[PDB]
Amino acid sequence: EVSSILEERIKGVSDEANLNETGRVLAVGDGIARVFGLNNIQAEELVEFSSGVKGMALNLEPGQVGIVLFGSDRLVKEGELVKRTGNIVDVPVGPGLLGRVVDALGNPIDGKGPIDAAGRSRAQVKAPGILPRRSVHEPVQTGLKAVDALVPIGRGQRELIIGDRQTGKTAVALDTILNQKRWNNGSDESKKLYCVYVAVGQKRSTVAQLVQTLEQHDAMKYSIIVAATASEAAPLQYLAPFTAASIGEWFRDNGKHALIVYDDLSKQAVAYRQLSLLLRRPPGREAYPGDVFYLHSRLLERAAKLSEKEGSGSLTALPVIETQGGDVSAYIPTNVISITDGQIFLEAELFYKGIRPAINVGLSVSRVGSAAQVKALKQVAGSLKLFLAQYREVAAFAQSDLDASTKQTLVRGERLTQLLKQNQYSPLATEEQVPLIYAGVNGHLDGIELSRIGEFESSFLSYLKSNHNELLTEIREKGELSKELLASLKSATESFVAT
């Protein structure tokens, strides 16, 4: 069994051949070994030490080639062969990576045997050009009611998830992954989004929790989690989103759909800072590496929506940025805000105030907007945007002798706000998003008192399932709400509200 596998493995290593180029470490300090030798070395090429640590050679300096160690300092020690691997940083990519937790290099860290992969592709390749890209046109329903109505997310357009520190930012993201199960399970291959979650700089315990949570909701089977944990060396952390993008490319190029959620680019930044400053490359604004705008921009633009010429693939992306004390003027947030094409701004106050997901309706924007949103959901929730806008403006007036008009707004507004809460770590199908929102929009639930709004929500769903799962099925499949369907819906809501 295991004995046979080991016997296969010993047999599976063979004698080597003469290995071109060698170095001897000139000095190794600070995890920045600087090696004298390596006469022909391609820039950014992976070089392997005597000890067994791997490194890449970010600085090719005029007389020494400055390797950055991908492991603990102790491994390399002054003067020691530095072999030239001879392939610029590349990671296995393929359909086969589906369901394995792999580290930045690509080695299986899930321990579910060798990663079967169909190609190894370089980890720095340039983004799709002007003529390859065709404008966004396919909704991606995240399943959170607030995201799906208030801020639509479409295939192939990066949108930030910028919010306050440890306000369960990751939760908002994780919810998106869960909802993709609904489309994923089936047989329509122009519907499956194969998500890849890139956990950069998160403690190994946190990523273990992530792994378990995904397994619990039976979601590992369209997930690949590239994890470069907090422990892992600063080069590995640096290459972690770049590597991840390459994993995504197989999906994009082969013409599937996929969503890669880089969590959190704030920590990606910190890693780049560590590398650059230690390599003595010139410092820059807020002591962040000089070309830091350029680094983030390279990563985030690999996301795209390919034209029909180029196989109609996509690669939606959702970077998560941690705003330190909510200061959105900070250099690393500001750069990212510019680069991205949308924002979801989770606000700590809202989180505390029990609105979870805590999307601040005002300060979130979708720049690709109406291209996304299921056609049905668009129809019955144009109103929803406008109503909430009024509720925000008239919010402060909730401190007396108030006009009837003002009071009408307040009743409708409070009920809507209460309605848009979603219980954590459970997604909600699109076919039930359109009915629930319909009720609030048509003002049926205005009468219902705030405490009973929650009870009403679940009841409405069960009521819809019993009374007219014909109506629900029509809503789901037709995907567009015809006047006749809206008619039936009005009746159904009337019946439901009456009971």
Partner: protein, 187 residues
């Protein structure tokens, strides 16, 4: 440009010295004189190798040069100007560094290549010869060049041999193989 570059200070001195004597076309002469002045410096250990300490004057440095060219009157003349230069730049203290560096550069011009056969413990003379023959025969030594193959003792490399020359190595050793072997059975 002179074959074989020497990165950094003190070897910029060597680079200059070589190319300067290359246009005089008296490189052998230079080399011979450099060996000789280095040798009589080295063979005057206290007072004149241990008085290369960096603390001497400009005037005292000039007089150290004057004593050096007093010690023998056979010097290339380019290397007599070189003595002046190192004194004048008051980097005379690194004297032997330039000498060694000129040597490295010189014997590349001569054609000689250096190798190494690091092993755990010294190996047979029969092995030395067989490896030397093979290595010289191979295309790796282009020929029109020589190989001063040096076995060195490195205990850290457990058994085997590692051939090194031209910054190109073939490492077939037991320590290195053991490393890879061990690793593969820890998967």
């Amino acid at each position: 440009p002179p074959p074989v570059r020497l990165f950094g200070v003190e070897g910029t001195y060597a680079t200059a010295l070589y190319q300067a004597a290359a246009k005089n076309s008296s490189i052998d002469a230079a080399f011979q004189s450099l060996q000789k002045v280095e040798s009589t410096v080295k063979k005057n250990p206290k007072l004149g190798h241990l008085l290369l300490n960096p603390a001497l004057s400009l005037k005292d440095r000039n007089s150290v040069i004057d004593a050096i060219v007093e010690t023998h009157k056979n010097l290339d003349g380019y290397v007599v100007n070189l003595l002046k230069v190192l004194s004048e730049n008051n980097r005379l203290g690194c004297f032997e560094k330039i000498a060694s560096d000129f040597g490295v550069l010189n014997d590349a011009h001569n054609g000689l290549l250096k190798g190494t056969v690091t092993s755990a413990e010294p190996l047979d003379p029969k092995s030395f010869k067989r490896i030397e023959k093979a290595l010289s025969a191979s295309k790796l030594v282009g020929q029109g060049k020589s190989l001063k193959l040096e076995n060195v003792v490195k205990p850290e490399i457990k058994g085997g041999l590692i051939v090194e020359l031209g910054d190109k190595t073939v490492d077939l050793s037991i320590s290195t193989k053991i490393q890879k072997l061990n690793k593969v059975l820890e998967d």
